Design an enzyme around this catalytic site. Structure first.
Site, PDB file in Angstrom:
ATOM      1  N   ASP A 209       0.779  -1.246   0.000  1.00 38.08           N
ATOM      2  CA  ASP A 209       0.000   0.000   0.000  1.00 38.08           C
ATOM      3  C   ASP A 209       0.818   1.309   0.000  1.00 38.08           C
ATOM      4  O   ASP A 209       1.396   1.658   1.019  1.00 38.08           O
ATOM      5  CB  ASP A 209      -0.943  -0.056   1.223  1.00 38.08           C
ATOM      6  CG  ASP A 209      -1.987   1.028   1.401  1.00 38.08           C
ATOM      7  OD1 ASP A 209      -2.231   1.778   0.442  1.00 38.08           O
ATOM      8  OD2 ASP A 209      -2.624   1.069   2.488  1.00 38.08           O
TER       9      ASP A 209
ATOM     10  N   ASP B 210      -2.215   5.455  -5.215  1.00 37.61           N
ATOM     11  CA  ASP B 210      -2.485   4.460  -4.189  1.00 37.61           C
ATOM     12  C   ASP B 210      -2.603   3.007  -4.667  1.00 37.61           C
ATOM     13  O   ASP B 210      -3.686   2.544  -5.063  1.00 37.61           O
ATOM     14  CB  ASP B 210      -3.771   4.889  -3.465  1.00 37.61           C
ATOM     15  CG  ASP B 210      -3.993   4.309  -2.099  1.00 37.61           C
ATOM     16  OD1 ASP B 210      -3.192   3.452  -1.681  1.00 37.61           O
ATOM     17  OD2 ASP B 210      -4.983   4.700  -1.450  1.00 37.61           O
TER      18      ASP B 210
HETATM   19  C1  LIG Z   1      -5.035   7.678   7.541  1.00 34.82           C
HETATM   20  C2  LIG Z   1      -4.405   6.429   6.858  1.00 34.82           C
HETATM   21  C3  LIG Z   1      -4.204   5.345   7.982  1.00 34.82           C
HETATM   22  C4  LIG Z   1      -3.005   6.878   6.306  1.00 34.82           C
HETATM   23  O1  LIG Z   1      -5.203   6.038   5.679  1.00 34.82           O
HETATM   24  C5  LIG Z   1      -4.945   4.922   4.964  1.00 34.82           C
HETATM   25  O2  LIG Z   1      -4.068   4.118   5.266  1.00 34.82           O
HETATM   26  N1  LIG Z   1      -5.749   4.765   3.869  1.00 34.82           N
HETATM   27  C6  LIG Z   1      -5.478   3.588   3.009  1.00 34.82           C
HETATM   28  C7  LIG Z   1      -4.825   4.038   1.669  1.00 34.82           C
HETATM   29  N2  LIG Z   1      -4.738   2.925   0.678  1.00 34.82           N
HETATM   30  C8  LIG Z   1      -5.947   2.084   0.446  1.00 34.82           C
HETATM   31  C9  LIG Z   1      -6.290   1.480   1.824  1.00 34.82           C
HETATM   32  C10 LIG Z   1      -7.361   0.386   1.852  1.00 34.82           C
HETATM   33  O3  LIG Z   1      -8.486   0.780   1.590  1.00 34.82           O
HETATM   34  N3  LIG Z   1      -7.168  -0.931   2.222  1.00 34.82           N
HETATM   35  C11 LIG Z   1      -8.369  -1.749   2.440  1.00 34.82           C
HETATM   36  C12 LIG Z   1      -8.930  -2.724   1.399  1.00 34.82           C
HETATM   37  C13 LIG Z   1      -8.739  -2.590   0.016  1.00 34.82           C
HETATM   38  C14 LIG Z   1      -9.373  -3.505  -0.852  1.00 34.82           C
HETATM   39  C15 LIG Z   1     -10.196  -4.540  -0.369  1.00 34.82           C
HETATM   40  C16 LIG Z   1     -10.418  -4.651   1.010  1.00 34.82           C
HETATM   41 CL1  LIG Z   1     -11.484  -5.897   1.653  1.00 34.82          CL
HETATM   42  C17 LIG Z   1      -9.794  -3.739   1.880  1.00 34.82           C
HETATM   43 CL2  LIG Z   1     -10.100  -3.896   3.599  1.00 34.82          CL
HETATM   44  C18 LIG Z   1      -5.867  -1.483   2.637  1.00 34.82           C
HETATM   45  C19 LIG Z   1      -5.422  -2.842   2.040  1.00 34.82           C
HETATM   46  C20 LIG Z   1      -4.720  -1.555   1.601  1.00 34.82           C
HETATM   47  C21 LIG Z   1      -6.717   2.686   2.731  1.00 34.82           C
END
Ligand SMILES: CC(C)(C)OC(=O)N[C@@H]1CNC[C@H](C(=O)N(Cc2cccc(Cl)c2Cl)C2CC2)C1
Ligand SMILES: *[C@@H]1O[C@H](CO)[C@@H](O)[C@H](O)[C@H]1NC(C)=O
Length: 335
Positions: free
Chosen positions: A36, A221
């Site tokens: 990420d 991202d």
């Molecule tokens: C404030 C701060 C903590 C910096 O914000 C972030 O980190 N914001 C993150 C920035 N990048 C995308 C991240 C995200 O949404 N997921 C969740 C996800 C994605 C796809 C499918 C599923 Cl099921 C999930 Cl749970 C993490 C796995 C990377 C949120």
């Protein structure tokens, strides 16, 4: 600087999750992880997670009692994600990522909500962001890998493939793989250090620059599944496409998906265009079925937001290079 360029093979799960393997501890405990660029912390589910969290029962859990290289910390850690929230505590152990071994501080997660983590095929997350975004100011894994002086260059790059039994994707630490891109990289310098965010000078639906006419922010991202914008930006965008808002997603009728206009993102010099085959989940061509778009609304809070986020939807078409040395992001057409 050394002469090592290592790669992590990724698994493509449904064009929404791209995860590779990392090993934590002695002997190694393996976890499926998302790399990420929108976050900077490393975290995996913990054995100290209560079995009442159904997400924890369905993911690999790190057990410190089985690791001889483990070093206790215990500092609390709360990660408030745009999709959900995770709480746990910090721990230090040896982490292996593509043949590179680093001593790393990470979070052992003890509170993992079912919605959304019951949908996660991956166990945890390896934050590829800057120290400035790391919760508890923990040194990110790439900064620790840089410190070893083993990498050929202070860069890492991403390749995300279209779903198929082929290669899901790839991260190259220390460079880029020319087998997965064509032409040359066009760089866009970061607005400021600390975020993998660049300036975007317009989003166009077809021919007409419908949004971001006076400029706006673009977060690159790797952890985001879809392309995202603010609720207002996405409302205007979806009205231009003829897209109907459902609860979590936006849909069109499957039959009218291949006719939808191209969407362009004006970054650096170039226009980065996605056709409807790049942003519609074309599951059928039926006038009786709904087809989801790979764009959704996400109001990111300050300092980072309001911003657009160029997630997996963008990276599949454009192979991305994240340059720590020159604080820029390079794009090339993926192959
Ligand atoms: C404030 C701060 C903590 C910096 O914000 C972030 O980190 N914001 C993150 C920035 N990048 C995308 C991240 C995200 O949404 N997921 C969740 C996800 C994605 C796809 C499918 C599923 Cl099921 C999930 Cl749970 C993490 C796995 C990377 C949120
Ligand atoms: C946890 O890690 C930080 C890292 O800087 C360290 O300074 C701190 O002393 C550690 N805390 C405990 C309780 O070991």
């Amino acid at each position: 600087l050394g002469n090592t360029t290592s790669s992590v093979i990724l698994t493509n799960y449904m064009d929404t999750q791209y995860y590779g393997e990392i090993g934590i501890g002695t002997p190694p405990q393996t976890f499926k992880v998302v790399f990420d660029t929108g976050s900077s912390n490393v975290w995996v589910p913990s054995s100290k997670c209560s079995r009442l969290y159904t997400a924890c029962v369905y993911h690999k859990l790190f057990d410190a009692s089985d690791s001889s290289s483990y070093k206790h910390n215990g500092t609390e850690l709360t990660l408030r994600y745009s999709t959900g929230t995770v709480s746990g505590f910090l721990s230090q152990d040896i982490i292996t990522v593509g043949g590179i071994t680093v001593t790393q501080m990470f979070g052992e997660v003890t509170e993992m909500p079912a919605l959304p983590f019951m949908l996660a095929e991956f166990d945890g997350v390896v934050g590829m962001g800057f120290i400035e975004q790391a919760i508890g100011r923990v040194t990110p894994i790439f900064d620790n890998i840089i410190s070893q002086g083993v990498l050929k260059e202070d860069v890492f790059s991403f390749y995300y493939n279209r779903d198929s039994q082929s290669l899901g994707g790839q991260i190259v630490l220390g460079g880029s793989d020319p087998q997965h891109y064509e032409g040359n990289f066009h760089y866009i310098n970061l607005i400021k250090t600390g975020v993998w965010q660049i300036q975007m000078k317009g989003v166009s639906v077809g021919s007409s620059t419908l949004l971001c006419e006076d400029g706006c922010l673009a977060l690159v991202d790797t952890g985001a599944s879809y392309i995202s914008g603010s609720t207002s930006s996405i409302e205007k965008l979806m009205e231009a496409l003829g897209a109907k808002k459902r609860l979590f997603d936006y849909v069109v009728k499957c039959n009218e998906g291949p006719t939808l206009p191209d969407i362009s993102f004006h970054l650096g010099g170039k226009e980065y265009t996605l056709t409807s085959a790049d942003y519609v989940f074309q599951e059928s061509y039926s006038s009786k079925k709904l087809c989801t778009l790979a764009i959704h609304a996400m109001d990111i809070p300050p300092p980072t937001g309001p911003t657009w986020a160029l997630g997996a939807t963008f990276i599949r078409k454009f192979y991305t290079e994240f340059d720590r040395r020159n604080n820029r992001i390079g794009f090339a057409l993926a192959r």
